[PDB]
């Protein structure tokens, strides 16, 4: 029922930007780059912030001012755009990353004023930790009634269903993770 | 004067390369370390030059643009003036402390302004004077048939002349700066690099750590030691103590254990002998 209108408008306009932004020469820039995502190893598409700026200042400003709230809707736009063009296994998921941002902030300027806003910094690395797999969307099997629960999205602590859609089950604990149809992403700290 | 060898090594690296290198615990990087050094050092003994008295090597001492020596003059008028200045300081009062403070603030502003905008650049007169100064220092060695100037000395003169030009707030470095730079450099050479054994500036003090007198004495001792061993050359092994007593019985100088062993080491590097404990053996 409820819909975040601001987010939906951003999704529509960002899709139009990807499909309509012609180069200095005449071909659609990001359409050509998108073809590399067919490779198994590739997940992330890089977008230039100044290119985004040329389409409309309102969209540029909204993205920077509302980034964390809006970000998952940009991924859906790229997912849709790629799916149109060439065949890829449908279980794969795609990511958007921005660069050429016009400004820079000091470490001591990073304060709770700008939680959630798009930002750029620089520093010197002291230590770097191993790679791990991180769960983003779980699939669970409810054992007492043999029914599957899909796209259980995670937050900081590991969360799961406790009662299923199937009403006769009366379960609370007997749930099994499908580690073959769940999906993960690579994670690293520095 | 009493920093350790590792500190001396990293200091040498910084003053030559103007950067510092790190490789530890997974961290590998290079840092900018372009810093101006001002150092205070200790051993006085007038019979020996500064580097001959203090601990540190010539590798480091040869990097300073100027070197100064501070000691008492044994002058009644100097003590009287120093005590009078001390008495004046005992009665030090706001009537002049405020004036000195104001001049200090103005001097900070002067330095900051000059540093912010002024860039002295070469003139024909300064170039001629600097070339002539280098030629003077090469000529000073020519009477002894030896080197007495190299490019690092000319760099010190150039830096001092640029600084003096900047003090005048001049965008040109000129003969005024070079003559003062020559004066300071000559005075510094006189005080820092004079051999007190002759009253003459000996550059080998600053480039090797000793007067040429020491070098000559060491060579003569090595030749005397070689002649003593050769005079007993029918024997393959000679006792260390016997050779020390022979040398000390034939020398006018009271030769030390260190001098004797340095001569033995020199003759070993010359492949003339091998020292096996208390016995010296011929090659
Ligand atoms: Zn159930």
UniProtKB/Swiss-Prot annotation, chain A:
A GO CC annotation given for this chain: cytosol
Name recorded for this polypeptide: DNA replication licensing factor MCM6
Locations listed in the record: Nucleus; Chromosome
Species whose genome carries this gene: Homo sapiens
Effect of residue 142 to Y: Found in patients with microcephaly, developmental delay, typical facial characteristics, endocrine disorders, feeding difficulties and urogenital anomalies; uncertain significance; impairs cell proliferation and ciliogenesis
GO molecular function: ATP binding; ATP hydrolysis activity; DNA helicase activity; identical protein binding; single-stranded DNA binding
Recorded name of the encoding gene: MCM6
Family: Belongs to the MCM family.
Function statement: Acts as a component of the MCM2-7 complex (MCM complex) which is the replicative helicase essential for 'once per cell cycle' DNA replication initiation and elongation in eukaryotic cells. Core component of CDC45-MCM-GINS (CMG) helicase, the molecular machine that unwinds template DNA during replication, and around which the replisome is built.
Modification after translation: O-glycosylated (O-GlcNAcylated), in a cell cycle-dependent manner.
GO biological process terms, semicolon-separated: DNA replication; DNA replication initiation; double-strand break repair via break-induced replication; mitotic DNA replication; regulation of DNA-templated DNA replication initiation
Other comments on record: Early fractionation of eukaryotic MCM proteins yielded a variety of dimeric, trimeric and tetrameric complexes with unclear biological significance. Specifically a MCM467 subcomplex is shown to have in vitro helicase activity which is inhibited by the MCM2 subunit. The MCM2-7 hexamer is the proposed physiological active complex.
UniProt KW Cell cycle keyword: yes
Keywords: Acetylation, ATP-binding, Cell cycle, Chromosome, DNA replication, DNA-binding, Glycoprotein, Helicase, Hydrolase, Nucleotide-binding, Nucleus, Phosphoprotein
Subunit record text: Component of the MCM2-7 complex. The complex forms a toroidal hexameric ring with the proposed subunit order MCM2-MCM6-MCM4-MCM7-MCM3-MCM5. Component of the CMG helicase complex, a hexameric ring of related MCM2-7 subunits stabilized by CDC45 and the tetrameric GINS complex. May interact with MCM10. Interacts with TIPIN. Interacts with CDT1. Interacts with MCMBP. Interacts with DDI2.
Curated annotation (Swiss-Prot), chain B:
Protein residues bound to ATP 2: 42
Subcellular compartments: Nucleus; Chromosome
Sites of the Glycyl lysine isopeptide (Lys-Gly) (interchain with G-Cter in SUMO2) crosslink: 218
Annotated positions of the N6-acetyllysine modification: 278
Post-translational note: Sumoylated; SUMO2 modified in response to stress caused by inhibition of proteasome activity (in vitro).
Binding sites annotated in the UniProt record for ATP 1: 63, 152, 155
Coiled coil, from the record: none
Motif Arginine finger: chain residues: 62-65
Function noted in UniProt: Acts as a component of the MCM2-7 complex (MCM complex) which is the replicative helicase essential for 'once per cell cycle' DNA replication initiation and elongation in eukaryotic cells. Core component of CDC45-MCM-GINS (CMG) helicase, the molecular machine that unwinds template DNA during replication, and around which the replisome is built.
Additional observations: Early fractionation of eukaryotic MCM proteins yielded a variety of dimeric, trimeric and tetrameric complexes with unclear biological significance. Specifically a MCM467 subcomplex is shown to have in vitro helicase activity which is inhibited by the MCM2 subunit. The MCM2-7 hexamer is the proposed physiological active complex.
Family: Belongs to the MCM family.
Subunit (UniProt): Component of the MCM2-7 complex. The complex forms a toroidal hexameric ring with the proposed subunit order MCM2-MCM6-MCM4-MCM7-MCM3-MCM5. Component of the CMG helicase complex, a hexameric ring of related MCM2-7 subunits stabilized by CDC45 and the tetrameric GINS complex. Interacts with MCMBP.
Recorded disease: Immunodeficiency 54: An autosomal recessive disorder characterized by severe intra- and extrauterine growth retardation, microcephaly, decreased numbers of natural killer cells, and recurrent viral infections, most often affecting the respiratory tract and leading to respiratory failure. Affected individuals also have adrenal insufficiency requiring corticosteroid replacement therapy and may have an increased susceptibility to cancer.
Descriptive protein name: DNA replication licensing factor MCM4
Organism: Homo sapiens (Human)
């Amino acid at each position: 029922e409820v819909r975040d209108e601001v987010a939906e408008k951003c999704q529509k306009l960002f899709l139009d930007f990807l499909e309509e932004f012609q180069s200095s020469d005449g071909e659609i820039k990001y359409l050509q780059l998108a073809e590399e995502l067919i490779r198994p190893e590739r997940n992330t598409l890089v977008v230039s912030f100044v290119d985004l700026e040329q389409f409309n200042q309102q969209l540029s400003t909204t993205i920077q001012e509302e980034f964390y709230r809006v970000y998952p809707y940009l991924c859906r736009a790229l997912k849709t755009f790629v799916k149109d063009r060439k065949e890829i296994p449908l279980a794969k998921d795609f990511y958007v990353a921005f660069q050429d941002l016009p400004t820079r902030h000091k470490i001591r300027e990073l304060t709770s004023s700008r939680i959630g806003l798009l930002t750029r910094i620089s520093g010197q690395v002291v230590r770097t930790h191993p790679v791990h797999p991180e769960l983003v969307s779980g699939t669970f099997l409810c054992l007492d009634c043999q029914t599957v629960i899909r796209d259980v999205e995670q937050q900081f602590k590991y969360t799961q269903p406790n009662i299923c859609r199937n009403p006769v089950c009366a379960n609370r604990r007997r749930f099994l993770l499908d580690t073959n149809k769940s999906r993960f992403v690579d994670f690293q700290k520095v | 004067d009493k920093m350790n060898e590792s500190t001396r090594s990293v200091l040498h690296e910084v003053m030559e390369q103007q950067t510092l290198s790190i490789a530890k615990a997974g961290i590998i990087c290079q840092l900018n370390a372009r810093t101006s050094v001002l150092a205070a050092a200790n051993p006085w003994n007038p019979k020996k030059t500064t580097i001959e008295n203090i601990q540190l090597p010539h590798t480091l001492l040869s990097r300073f643009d100027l070197i100064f020596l501070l000691l008492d003059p044994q002058d009644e008028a100097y003590d009287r003036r120093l005590a009078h200045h001390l008495v004046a300081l005992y009665y030090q009062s706001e009537e002049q402390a405020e004036e000195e403070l104001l001049d200090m603030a103005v001097l900070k502003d002067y330095i900051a302004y000059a540093h912010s905008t002024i860039m002295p650049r070469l003139s024909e007169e300064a170039s001629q004077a600097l070339i002539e100064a280098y030629v003077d220092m090469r000529k000073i060695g020519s009477s002894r048939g030896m080197v007495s100037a190299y490019p690092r000395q000319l760099e010190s003169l150039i830096r001092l002349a640029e600084a003096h030009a900047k003090v005048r707030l001049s965008n040109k470095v000129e003969a005024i700066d070079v003559e003062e730079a020559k004066r300071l450099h000559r005075e510094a050479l006189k005080q820092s690099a004079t051999d007190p054994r002759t009253g003459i500036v000996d550059i080998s003090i600053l480039t090797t750590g000793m007067s040429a007198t020491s070098r000559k004495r060491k060579e003569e001792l090595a030749e005397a030691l070689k002649k003593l061993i050769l005079s007993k050359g029918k024997t393959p092994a000679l006792k260390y103590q016997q050779l020390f007593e022979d040398i000390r019985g034939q020398s006018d100088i009271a030769i030390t254990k260190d001098m004797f062993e340095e001569a033995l080491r020199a003759l070993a590097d010359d492949d003339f002998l091998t020292v096996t404990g208390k016995t010296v053996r011929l090659l």
